Amino acid sequence: GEELFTGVVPILVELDGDVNGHKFSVRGEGEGDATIGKLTLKFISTTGKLPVPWPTLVTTLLQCFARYPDHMKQHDFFKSAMPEGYVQERTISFKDDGKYKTRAVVKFEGDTLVNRIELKGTDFKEDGNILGHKLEYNFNSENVYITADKQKNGIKANFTVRHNVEDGSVQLADHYQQNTPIGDGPVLLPDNHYLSDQTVLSKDPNEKRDHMVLLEFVTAAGIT
């Protein structure tokens, strides 16, 4: 499982979604280098303009590319699930607004790591930050705390994203996360640790479609 990640791995991401009715589709491509925890990706809304702000989709749009230091490598559930992969499910509650429920299947197809995502959002207020598009095109990166869940055979994460709003306010996004492997063989289950995230969003000056360029560095830490 960890042997699949010794080099650069091409990535394909495919997202289908609906939010308060507004359907859309997102396709992403790039590569991951788990030796340095580096993801480089580019995502396009193939259905036209994205009805939600891009920063709201960043956590949904490959934690198997986190760099786990050598003294932590027996805590890396994401790569242990490979190649059969894992199901990643989240509930993303927005304060004073709606919530995203996502379900993702992350596995290898040949040499390409593929993430297939379904997203559904409900109870969104059309004048509020999300549908209003009142959020800034940036990202505040923080730590993801991971705990093992031996009974359900997987892991859980719980974090809160703080989205800057164009008026100086902050729109919070409470994430609950569950990952569960697809194959039947045993997987590594970790002691409590965290993933440290560094995220940079940009734009591709020649890309005419609604998109997002994403550079991420992800490192496990919290065990000495």
Side-chain angles (χ1 to χ4, degrees):
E2 68 196 37
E3 269 314 293
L4 301 170
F5 296 88
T6 48
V8 175
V9 173
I11 296 160
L12 164 67
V13 187
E14 297 183 334
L15 157 65
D16 283 316
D18 42 302
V19 173
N20 272 28
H22 308 82
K23 288 188 188 166
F24 60 95
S25 302
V26 174
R27 306 294 255 279
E29 60 144 331
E31 64 189 20
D33 189 341
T35 66
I36 48 162
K38 184 177 176 174
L39 286 162
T40 54
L41 292 158
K42 177 185 168 169
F43 304 90
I44 293 98
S45 170
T46 49
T47 47
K49 273 185 203 181
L50 197 73
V52 309
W54 286 99
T56 73
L57 293 180
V58 169
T59 59
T60 293
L61 296 162
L62 307 156
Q63 284 178 320
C64 54
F65 288 107
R67 177 169 80 90
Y68 274 73
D70 180 81
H71 79 276
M72 291 188 62
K73 273 185 170 179
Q74 310 325 301
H75 302 261
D76 185 348
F77 160 93
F78 308 99
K79 295 184 193 60
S80 83
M82 298 294 174
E84 296 169 287
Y86 52 80
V87 184
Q88 183 169 293
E89 298 177 58
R90 285 207 194 92
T91 285
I92 309 182
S93 311
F94 296 89
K95 179 166 302 180
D96 313 309
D97 219 319
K99 54 179 196 294
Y100 293 163
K101 291 192 193 296
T102 64
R103 183 180 176 275
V105 162
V106 190
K107 78 172 183 172
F108 276 93
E109 298 281 3
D111 285 343
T112 303
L113 194 279
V114 181
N115 186 7
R116 307 185 159 288
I117 307 166
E118 267 270 18
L119 174 148
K120 285 156 187 174
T122 52
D123 282 293
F124 279 103
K125 308 173 185 176
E126 53 231 8
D127 199 51
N129 300 348
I130 313 308
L131 294 173
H133 297 282
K134 306 197 191 183
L135 299 191
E136 291 178 343
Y137 188 66
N138 51 28
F139 202 78
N140 301 315
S141 291
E142 299 193 86
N143 293 331
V144 174
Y145 296 93
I146 293 175
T147 53
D149 181 22
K150 286 193 204 177
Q151 218 56 218
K152 299 174 188 178
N153 198 37
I155 56 171
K156 289 189 190 172
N158 273 280
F159 53 105
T160 299
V161 174
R162 308 167 53 92
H163 297 286
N164 292 346
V165 200
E166 76 197 0
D167 66 337
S169 166
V170 170
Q171 170 77 44
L172 312 157
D174 193 7
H175 289 63
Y176 162 86
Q177 174 177 341
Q178 193 154 213
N179 301 64
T180 66
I182 291 167
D184 63 301
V187 295
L188 293 175
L189 263 25
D191 291 341
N192 288 22
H193 65 285
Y194 63 93
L195 306 179
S196 174
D197 299 81
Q198 298 91 45
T199 298
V200 176
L201 314 191
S202 48
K203 242 88 191 210
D204 171 3
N206 318 271
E207 175 53 66
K208 302 169 177 172
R209 297 161 299 176
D210 203 336
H211 67 275
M212 173 178 69
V213 180
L214 170 58
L215 164 61
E216 274 190 39
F217 289 96
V218 187
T219 316
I223 303 193
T224 282

PDB file of all heavy atoms in Angstrom, residues 96-129:
ATOM      1  N   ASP A  96     -25.099  29.313  10.349  1.00  0.00           N
ATOM      2  CA  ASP A  96     -26.180  30.166   9.857  1.00  0.00           C
ATOM      3  C   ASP A  96     -26.473  29.906   8.382  1.00  0.00           C
ATOM      4  O   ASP A  96     -26.890  30.807   7.652  1.00  0.00           O
ATOM      5  CB  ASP A  96     -25.872  31.650  10.091  1.00  0.00           C
ATOM      6  CG  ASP A  96     -25.388  31.931  11.503  1.00  0.00           C
ATOM      7  OD1 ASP A  96     -26.060  31.510  12.466  1.00  0.00           O
ATOM      8  OD2 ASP A  96     -24.324  32.573  11.646  1.00  0.00           O
ATOM      9  N   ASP A  97     -26.261  28.674   7.935  1.00  0.00           N
ATOM     10  CA  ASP A  97     -26.490  28.324   6.539  1.00  0.00           C
ATOM     11  C   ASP A  97     -26.686  26.809   6.452  1.00  0.00           C
ATOM     12  O   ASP A  97     -27.052  26.164   7.442  1.00  0.00           O
ATOM     13  CB  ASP A  97     -25.334  28.842   5.664  1.00  0.00           C
ATOM     14  CG  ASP A  97     -25.810  29.387   4.328  1.00  0.00           C
ATOM     15  OD1 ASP A  97     -26.701  28.773   3.707  1.00  0.00           O
ATOM     16  OD2 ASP A  97     -25.286  30.433   3.898  1.00  0.00           O
ATOM     17  N   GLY A  98     -26.453  26.245   5.274  1.00  0.00           N
ATOM     18  CA  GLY A  98     -26.729  24.848   5.017  1.00  0.00           C
ATOM     19  C   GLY A  98     -25.579  23.939   5.386  1.00  0.00           C
ATOM     20  O   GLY A  98     -24.691  24.296   6.165  1.00  0.00           O
ATOM     21  N   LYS A  99     -25.606  22.733   4.815  1.00  0.00           N
ATOM     22  CA  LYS A  99     -24.539  21.763   5.030  1.00  0.00           C
ATOM     23  C   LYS A  99     -24.311  20.919   3.779  1.00  0.00           C
ATOM     24  O   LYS A  99     -25.257  20.592   3.061  1.00  0.00           O
ATOM     25  CB  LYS A  99     -24.844  20.858   6.240  1.00  0.00           C
ATOM     26  CG  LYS A  99     -26.195  20.136   6.228  1.00  0.00           C
ATOM     27  CD  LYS A  99     -26.336  19.256   7.478  1.00  0.00           C
ATOM     28  CE  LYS A  99     -27.448  18.238   7.345  1.00  0.00           C
ATOM     29  NZ  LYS A  99     -28.778  18.886   7.272  1.00  0.00           N
ATOM     30  N   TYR A 100     -23.043  20.588   3.522  1.00  0.00           N
ATOM     31  CA  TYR A 100     -22.669  19.620   2.495  1.00  0.00           C
ATOM     32  C   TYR A 100     -22.592  18.234   3.116  1.00  0.00           C
ATOM     33  O   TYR A 100     -21.996  18.060   4.184  1.00  0.00           O
ATOM     34  CB  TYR A 100     -21.303  19.942   1.878  1.00  0.00           C
ATOM     35  CG  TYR A 100     -21.189  21.202   1.049  1.00  0.00           C
ATOM     36  CD1 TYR A 100     -19.936  21.742   0.769  1.00  0.00           C
ATOM     37  CD2 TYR A 100     -22.315  21.851   0.537  1.00  0.00           C
ATOM     38  CE1 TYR A 100     -19.796  22.892   0.007  1.00  0.00           C
ATOM     39  CE2 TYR A 100     -22.185  23.009  -0.231  1.00  0.00           C
ATOM     40  CZ  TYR A 100     -20.919  23.525  -0.488  1.00  0.00           C
ATOM     41  OH  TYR A 100     -20.756  24.670  -1.240  1.00  0.00           O
ATOM     42  N   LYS A 101     -23.164  17.245   2.440  1.00  0.00           N
ATOM     43  CA  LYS A 101     -22.892  15.842   2.729  1.00  0.00           C
ATOM     44  C   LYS A 101     -22.204  15.251   1.510  1.00  0.00           C
ATOM     45  O   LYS A 101     -22.776  15.246   0.415  1.00  0.00           O
ATOM     46  CB  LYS A 101     -24.169  15.064   3.066  1.00  0.00           C
ATOM     47  CG  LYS A 101     -24.822  15.442   4.399  1.00  0.00           C
ATOM     48  CD  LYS A 101     -25.902  14.431   4.787  1.00  0.00           C
ATOM     49  CE  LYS A 101     -26.790  14.921   5.933  1.00  0.00           C
ATOM     50  NZ  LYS A 101     -26.042  15.108   7.205  1.00  0.00           N
ATOM     51  N   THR A 102     -20.979  14.771   1.696  1.00  0.00           N
ATOM     52  CA  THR A 102     -20.184  14.220   0.608  1.00  0.00           C
ATOM     53  C   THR A 102     -19.911  12.747   0.866  1.00  0.00           C
ATOM     54  O   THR A 102     -19.947  12.283   2.007  1.00  0.00           O
ATOM     55  CB  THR A 102     -18.848  14.976   0.434  1.00  0.00           C
ATOM     56  OG1 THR A 102     -18.037  14.807   1.606  1.00  0.00           O
ATOM     57  CG2 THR A 102     -19.099  16.458   0.210  1.00  0.00           C
ATOM     58  N   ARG A 103     -19.669  12.010  -0.215  1.00  0.00           N
ATOM     59  CA  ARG A 103     -19.216  10.624  -0.149  1.00  0.00           C
ATOM     60  C   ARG A 103     -18.234  10.433  -1.290  1.00  0.00           C
ATOM     61  O   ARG A 103     -18.555  10.741  -2.441  1.00  0.00           O
ATOM     62  CB  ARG A 103     -20.378   9.615  -0.252  1.00  0.00           C
ATOM     63  CG  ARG A 103     -19.962   8.130  -0.119  1.00  0.00           C
ATOM     64  CD  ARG A 103     -21.166   7.162  -0.228  1.00  0.00           C
ATOM     65  NE  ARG A 103     -20.750   5.756  -0.195  1.00  0.00           N
ATOM     66  CZ  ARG A 103     -20.353   5.056  -1.260  1.00  0.00           C
ATOM     67  NH1 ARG A 103     -20.324   5.625  -2.463  1.00  0.00           N
ATOM     68  NH2 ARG A 103     -19.991   3.783  -1.125  1.00  0.00           N
ATOM     69  N   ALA A 104     -17.030   9.962  -0.975  1.00  0.00           N
ATOM     70  CA  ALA A 104     -15.965   9.855  -1.966  1.00  0.00           C
ATOM     71  C   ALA A 104     -15.401   8.445  -1.986  1.00  0.00           C
ATOM     72  O   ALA A 104     -15.244   7.818  -0.935  1.00  0.00           O
ATOM     73  CB  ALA A 104     -14.846  10.854  -1.673  1.00  0.00           C
ATOM     74  N   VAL A 105     -15.099   7.950  -3.184  1.00  0.00           N
ATOM     75  CA  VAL A 105     -14.426   6.669  -3.373  1.00  0.00           C
ATOM     76  C   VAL A 105     -13.045   6.933  -3.961  1.00  0.00           C
ATOM     77  O   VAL A 105     -12.919   7.413  -5.095  1.00  0.00           O
ATOM     78  CB  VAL A 105     -15.222   5.721  -4.280  1.00  0.00           C
ATOM     79  CG1 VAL A 105     -14.306   4.630  -4.801  1.00  0.00           C
ATOM     80  CG2 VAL A 105     -16.411   5.110  -3.525  1.00  0.00           C
ATOM     81  N   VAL A 106     -12.015   6.575  -3.215  1.00  0.00           N
ATOM     82  CA  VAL A 106     -10.633   6.905  -3.555  1.00  0.00           C
ATOM     83  C   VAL A 106      -9.900   5.595  -3.807  1.00  0.00           C
ATOM     84  O   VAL A 106      -9.707   4.813  -2.870  1.00  0.00           O
ATOM     85  CB  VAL A 106      -9.954   7.704  -2.437  1.00  0.00           C
ATOM     86  CG1 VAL A 106      -8.624   8.244  -2.921  1.00  0.00           C
ATOM     87  CG2 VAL A 106     -10.862   8.848  -1.944  1.00  0.00           C
ATOM     88  N   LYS A 107      -9.494   5.341  -5.052  1.00  0.00           N
ATOM     89  CA  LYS A 107      -8.797   4.097  -5.350  1.00  0.00           C
ATOM     90  C   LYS A 107      -7.977   4.245  -6.619  1.00  0.00           C
ATOM     91  O   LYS A 107      -8.147   5.188  -7.391  1.00  0.00           O
ATOM     92  CB  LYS A 107      -9.764   2.920  -5.483  1.00  0.00           C
ATOM     93  CG  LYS A 107     -10.531   2.834  -6.790  1.00  0.00           C
ATOM     94  CD  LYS A 107     -11.314   1.484  -6.848  1.00  0.00           C
ATOM     95  CE  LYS A 107     -12.045   1.335  -8.172  1.00  0.00           C
ATOM     96  NZ  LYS A 107     -12.689   0.004  -8.420  1.00  0.00           N
ATOM     97  N   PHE A 108      -7.099   3.272  -6.836  1.00  0.00           N
ATOM     98  CA  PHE A 108      -6.300   3.235  -8.050  1.00  0.00           C
ATOM     99  C   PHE A 108      -7.076   2.620  -9.210  1.00  0.00           C
ATOM    100  O   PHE A 108      -7.812   1.641  -9.046  1.00  0.00           O
ATOM    101  CB  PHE A 108      -5.019   2.436  -7.826  1.00  0.00           C
ATOM    102  CG  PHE A 108      -3.917   3.239  -7.222  1.00  0.00           C
ATOM    103  CD1 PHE A 108      -3.738   3.259  -5.848  1.00  0.00           C
ATOM    104  CD2 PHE A 108      -3.062   3.985  -8.029  1.00  0.00           C
ATOM    105  CE1 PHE A 108      -2.716   4.021  -5.269  1.00  0.00           C
ATOM    106  CE2 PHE A 108      -2.052   4.719  -7.476  1.00  0.00           C
ATOM    107  CZ  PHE A 108      -1.859   4.730  -6.076  1.00  0.00           C
ATOM    108  N   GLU A 109      -6.901   3.205 -10.381  1.00  0.00           N
ATOM    109  CA  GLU A 109      -7.312   2.615 -11.651  1.00  0.00           C
ATOM    110  C   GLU A 109      -6.041   2.550 -12.475  1.00  0.00           C
ATOM    111  O   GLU A 109      -5.572   3.575 -12.978  1.00  0.00           O
ATOM    112  CB  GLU A 109      -8.392   3.442 -12.344  1.00  0.00           C
ATOM    113  CG  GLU A 109      -9.693   3.565 -11.555  1.00  0.00           C
ATOM    114  CD  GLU A 109     -10.587   2.348 -11.654  1.00  0.00           C
ATOM    115  OE1 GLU A 109     -10.224   1.324 -12.297  1.00  0.00           O
ATOM    116  OE2 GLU A 109     -11.694   2.427 -11.093  1.00  0.00           O
ATOM    117  N   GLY A 110      -5.473   1.359 -12.598  1.00  0.00           N
ATOM    118  CA  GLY A 110      -4.150   1.293 -13.182  1.00  0.00           C
ATOM    119  C   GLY A 110      -3.196   2.097 -12.320  1.00  0.00           C
ATOM    120  O   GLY A 110      -3.177   1.969 -11.086  1.00  0.00           O
ATOM    121  N   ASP A 111      -2.429   2.984 -12.961  1.00  0.00           N
ATOM    122  CA  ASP A 111      -1.439   3.778 -12.254  1.00  0.00           C
ATOM    123  C   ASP A 111      -1.984   5.113 -11.767  1.00  0.00           C
ATOM    124  O   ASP A 111      -1.271   5.846 -11.084  1.00  0.00           O
ATOM    125  CB  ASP A 111      -0.208   3.994 -13.146  1.00  0.00           C
ATOM    126  CG  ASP A 111       0.658   2.729 -13.247  1.00  0.00           C
ATOM    127  OD1 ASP A 111       0.483   1.828 -12.391  1.00  0.00           O
ATOM    128  OD2 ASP A 111       1.496   2.628 -14.181  1.00  0.00           O
ATOM    129  N   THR A 112      -3.237   5.421 -12.057  1.00  0.00           N
ATOM    130  CA  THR A 112      -3.826   6.700 -11.697  1.00  0.00           C
ATOM    131  C   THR A 112      -4.650   6.546 -10.430  1.00  0.00           C
ATOM    132  O   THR A 112      -5.499   5.657 -10.344  1.00  0.00           O
ATOM    133  CB  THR A 112      -4.706   7.220 -12.835  1.00  0.00           C
ATOM    134  OG1 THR A 112      -3.915   7.317 -14.023  1.00  0.00           O
ATOM    135  CG2 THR A 112      -5.256   8.591 -12.476  1.00  0.00           C
ATOM    136  N   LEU A 113      -4.401   7.424  -9.457  1.00  0.00           N
ATOM    137  CA  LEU A 113      -5.232   7.484  -8.267  1.00  0.00           C
ATOM    138  C   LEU A 113      -6.477   8.305  -8.596  1.00  0.00           C
ATOM    139  O   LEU A 113      -6.360   9.468  -9.005  1.00  0.00           O
ATOM    140  CB  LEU A 113      -4.413   8.079  -7.116  1.00  0.00           C
ATOM    141  CG  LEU A 113      -4.907   7.977  -5.673  1.00  0.00           C
ATOM    142  CD1 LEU A 113      -5.932   9.062  -5.408  1.00  0.00           C
ATOM    143  CD2 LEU A 113      -5.491   6.596  -5.372  1.00  0.00           C
ATOM    144  N   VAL A 114      -7.667   7.698  -8.465  1.00  0.00           N
ATOM    145  CA  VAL A 114      -8.923   8.323  -8.877  1.00  0.00           C
ATOM    146  C   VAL A 114      -9.796   8.587  -7.654  1.00  0.00           C
ATOM    147  O   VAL A 114     -10.015   7.689  -6.833  1.00  0.00           O
ATOM    148  CB  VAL A 114      -9.683   7.455  -9.899  1.00  0.00           C
ATOM    149  CG1 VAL A 114     -10.958   8.145 -10.306  1.00  0.00           C
ATOM    150  CG2 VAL A 114      -8.828   7.141 -11.126  1.00  0.00           C
ATOM    151  N   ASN A 115     -10.325   9.804  -7.550  1.00  0.00           N
ATOM    152  CA  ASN A 115     -11.286  10.172  -6.512  1.00  0.00           C
ATOM    153  C   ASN A 115     -12.624  10.483  -7.173  1.00  0.00           C
ATOM    154  O   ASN A 115     -12.708  11.434  -7.953  1.00  0.00           O
ATOM    155  CB  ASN A 115     -10.782  11.387  -5.725  1.00  0.00           C
ATOM    156  CG  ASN A 115     -11.667  11.734  -4.538  1.00  0.00           C
ATOM    157  OD1 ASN A 115     -12.603  11.006  -4.213  1.00  0.00           O
ATOM    158  ND2 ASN A 115     -11.365  12.845  -3.878  1.00  0.00           N
ATOM    159  N   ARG A 116     -13.664   9.687  -6.863  1.00  0.00           N
ATOM    160  CA  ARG A 116     -15.025   9.888  -7.370  1.00  0.00           C
ATOM    161  C   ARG A 116     -15.933  10.363  -6.245  1.00  0.00           C
ATOM    162  O   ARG A 116     -16.149   9.635  -5.271  1.00  0.00           O
ATOM    163  CB  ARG A 116     -15.600   8.602  -7.958  1.00  0.00           C
ATOM    164  CG  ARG A 116     -14.768   7.922  -8.990  1.00  0.00           C
ATOM    165  CD  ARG A 116     -15.559   6.748  -9.539  1.00  0.00           C
ATOM    166  NE  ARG A 116     -15.048   6.353 -10.839  1.00  0.00           N
ATOM    167  CZ  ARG A 116     -15.225   7.060 -11.953  1.00  0.00           C
ATOM    168  NH1 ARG A 116     -15.910   8.205 -11.932  1.00  0.00           N
ATOM    169  NH2 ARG A 116     -14.722   6.616 -13.098  1.00  0.00           N
ATOM    170  N   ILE A 117     -16.500  11.556  -6.397  1.00  0.00           N
ATOM    171  CA  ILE A 117     -17.186  12.250  -5.312  1.00  0.00           C
ATOM    172  C   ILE A 117     -18.628  12.549  -5.697  1.00  0.00           C
ATOM    173  O   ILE A 117     -18.900  13.092  -6.777  1.00  0.00           O
ATOM    174  CB  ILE A 117     -16.484  13.573  -4.948  1.00  0.00           C
ATOM    175  CG1 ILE A 117     -15.001  13.351  -4.673  1.00  0.00           C
ATOM    176  CG2 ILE A 117     -17.180  14.243  -3.758  1.00  0.00           C
ATOM    177  CD1 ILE A 117     -14.230  14.627  -4.656  1.00  0.00           C
ATOM    178  N   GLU A 118     -19.540  12.254  -4.773  1.00  0.00           N
ATOM    179  CA  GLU A 118     -20.904  12.766  -4.806  1.00  0.00           C
ATOM    180  C   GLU A 118     -21.100  13.731  -3.642  1.00  0.00           C
ATOM    181  O   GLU A 118     -20.747  13.412  -2.500  1.00  0.00           O
ATOM    182  CB  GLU A 118     -21.915  11.621  -4.742  1.00  0.00           C
ATOM    183  CG  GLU A 118     -22.364  11.125  -6.113  1.00  0.00           C
ATOM    184  CD  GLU A 118     -23.604  11.858  -6.638  1.00  0.00           C
ATOM    185  OE1 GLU A 118     -23.914  12.959  -6.123  1.00  0.00           O
ATOM    186  OE2 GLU A 118     -24.272  11.333  -7.563  1.00  0.00           O
ATOM    187  N   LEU A 119     -21.640  14.915  -3.939  1.00  0.00           N
ATOM    188  CA  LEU A 119     -21.873  15.962  -2.951  1.00  0.00           C
ATOM    189  C   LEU A 119     -23.330  16.394  -2.987  1.00  0.00           C
ATOM    190  O   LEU A 119     -23.879  16.655  -4.061  1.00  0.00           O
ATOM    191  CB  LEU A 119     -20.968  17.180  -3.203  1.00  0.00           C
ATOM    192  CG  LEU A 119     -21.189  18.423  -2.331  1.00  0.00           C
ATOM    193  CD1 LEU A 119     -19.876  19.158  -2.096  1.00  0.00           C
ATOM    194  CD2 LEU A 119     -22.218  19.381  -2.930  1.00  0.00           C
ATOM    195  N   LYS A 120     -23.943  16.519  -1.815  1.00  0.00           N
ATOM    196  CA  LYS A 120     -25.299  17.040  -1.741  1.00  0.00           C
ATOM    197  C   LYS A 120     -25.402  18.044  -0.603  1.00  0.00           C
ATOM    198  O   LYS A 120     -24.930  17.783   0.506  1.00  0.00           O
ATOM    199  CB  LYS A 120     -26.304  15.903  -1.572  1.00  0.00           C
ATOM    200  CG  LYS A 120     -26.500  15.142  -2.870  1.00  0.00           C
ATOM    201  CD  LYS A 120     -26.995  13.730  -2.659  1.00  0.00           C
ATOM    202  CE  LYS A 120     -26.997  12.987  -3.981  1.00  0.00           C
ATOM    203  NZ  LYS A 120     -27.338  11.552  -3.813  1.00  0.00           N
ATOM    204  N   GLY A 121     -25.994  19.191  -0.893  1.00  0.00           N
ATOM    205  CA  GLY A 121     -26.150  20.243   0.099  1.00  0.00           C
ATOM    206  C   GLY A 121     -27.596  20.671   0.219  1.00  0.00           C
ATOM    207  O   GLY A 121     -28.311  20.771  -0.777  1.00  0.00           O
ATOM    208  N   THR A 122     -28.019  20.928   1.453  1.00  0.00           N
ATOM    209  CA  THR A 122     -29.392  21.307   1.747  1.00  0.00           C
ATOM    210  C   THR A 122     -29.413  22.477   2.723  1.00  0.00           C
ATOM    211  O   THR A 122     -28.418  22.775   3.389  1.00  0.00           O
ATOM    212  CB  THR A 122     -30.186  20.129   2.332  1.00  0.00           C
ATOM    213  OG1 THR A 122     -29.464  19.574   3.437  1.00  0.00           O
ATOM    214  CG2 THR A 122     -30.400  19.045   1.285  1.00  0.00           C
ATOM    215  N   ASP A 123     -30.570  23.145   2.788  1.00  0.00           N
ATOM    216  CA  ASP A 123     -30.841  24.200   3.770  1.00  0.00           C
ATOM    217  C   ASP A 123     -29.914  25.401   3.609  1.00  0.00           C
ATOM    218  O   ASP A 123     -29.527  26.042   4.587  1.00  0.00           O
ATOM    219  CB  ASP A 123     -30.772  23.647   5.195  1.00  0.00           C
ATOM    220  CG  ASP A 123     -32.022  22.881   5.580  1.00  0.00           C
ATOM    221  OD1 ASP A 123     -33.100  23.515   5.686  1.00  0.00           O
ATOM    222  OD2 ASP A 123     -31.928  21.646   5.762  1.00  0.00           O
ATOM    223  N   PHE A 124     -29.576  25.737   2.369  1.00  0.00           N
ATOM    224  CA  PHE A 124     -28.722  26.890   2.118  1.00  0.00           C
ATOM    225  C   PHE A 124     -29.574  28.124   1.851  1.00  0.00           C
ATOM    226  O   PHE A 124     -30.559  28.063   1.107  1.00  0.00           O
ATOM    227  CB  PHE A 124     -27.763  26.622   0.956  1.00  0.00           C
ATOM    228  CG  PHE A 124     -26.547  25.819   1.354  1.00  0.00           C
ATOM    229  CD1 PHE A 124     -26.452  24.470   1.048  1.00  0.00           C
ATOM    230  CD2 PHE A 124     -25.515  26.411   2.059  1.00  0.00           C
ATOM    231  CE1 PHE A 124     -25.348  23.731   1.424  1.00  0.00           C
ATOM    232  CE2 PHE A 124     -24.406  25.678   2.442  1.00  0.00           C
ATOM    233  CZ  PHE A 124     -24.323  24.337   2.121  1.00  0.00           C
ATOM    234  N   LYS A 125     -29.199  29.234   2.484  1.00  0.00           N
ATOM    235  CA  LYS A 125     -29.866  30.512   2.295  1.00  0.00           C
ATOM    236  C   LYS A 125     -29.258  31.223   1.090  1.00  0.00           C
ATOM    237  O   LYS A 125     -28.039  31.399   1.017  1.00  0.00           O
ATOM    238  CB  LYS A 125     -29.738  31.363   3.559  1.00  0.00           C
ATOM    239  CG  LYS A 125     -30.179  30.637   4.826  1.00  0.00           C
ATOM    240  CD  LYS A 125     -29.879  31.449   6.073  1.00  0.00           C
ATOM    241  CE  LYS A 125     -30.216  30.666   7.329  1.00  0.00           C
ATOM    242  NZ  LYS A 125     -29.835  31.408   8.559  1.00  0.00           N
ATOM    243  N   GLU A 126     -30.115  31.632   0.149  1.00  0.00           N
ATOM    244  CA  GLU A 126     -29.639  32.142  -1.134  1.00  0.00           C
ATOM    245  C   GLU A 126     -28.941  33.495  -1.023  1.00  0.00           C
ATOM    246  O   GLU A 126     -28.180  33.857  -1.927  1.00  0.00           O
ATOM    247  CB  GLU A 126     -30.802  32.238  -2.118  1.00  0.00           C
ATOM    248  CG  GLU A 126     -31.993  33.015  -1.589  1.00  0.00           C
ATOM    249  CD  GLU A 126     -33.286  32.251  -1.750  1.00  0.00           C
ATOM    250  OE1 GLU A 126     -33.219  31.066  -2.136  1.00  0.00           O
ATOM    251  OE2 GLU A 126     -34.365  32.830  -1.498  1.00  0.00           O
ATOM    252  N   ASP A 127     -29.178  34.244   0.053  1.00  0.00           N
ATOM    253  CA  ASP A 127     -28.540  35.537   0.264  1.00  0.00           C
ATOM    254  C   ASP A 127     -27.312  35.444   1.168  1.00  0.00           C
ATOM    255  O   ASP A 127     -26.757  36.478   1.557  1.00  0.00           O
ATOM    256  CB  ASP A 127     -29.559  36.527   0.843  1.00  0.00           C
ATOM    257  CG  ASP A 127     -29.142  37.975   0.658  1.00  0.00           C
ATOM    258  OD1 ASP A 127     -28.806  38.357  -0.484  1.00  0.00           O
ATOM    259  OD2 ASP A 127     -29.162  38.735   1.653  1.00  0.00           O
ATOM    260  N   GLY A 128     -26.861  34.235   1.495  1.00  0.00           N
ATOM    261  CA  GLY A 128     -25.816  34.072   2.484  1.00  0.00           C
ATOM    262  C   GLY A 128     -24.524  33.446   1.997  1.00  0.00           C
ATOM    263  O   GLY A 128     -24.455  32.233   1.782  1.00  0.00           O
ATOM    264  N   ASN A 129     -23.497  34.282   1.825  1.00  0.00           N
ATOM    265  CA  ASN A 129     -22.101  33.886   1.627  1.00  0.00           C
ATOM    266  C   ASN A 129     -21.890  32.793   0.580  1.00  0.00           C
ATOM    267  O   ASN A 129     -21.122  32.989  -0.370  1.00  0.00           O
ATOM    268  CB  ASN A 129     -21.485  33.454   2.966  1.00  0.00           C
ATOM    269  CG  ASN A 129     -21.511  34.571   4.014  1.00  0.00           C
ATOM    270  OD1 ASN A 129     -21.775  35.736   3.696  1.00  0.00           O
ATOM    271  ND2 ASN A 129     -21.238  34.218   5.266  1.00  0.00           N
TER     272      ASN A 129
END
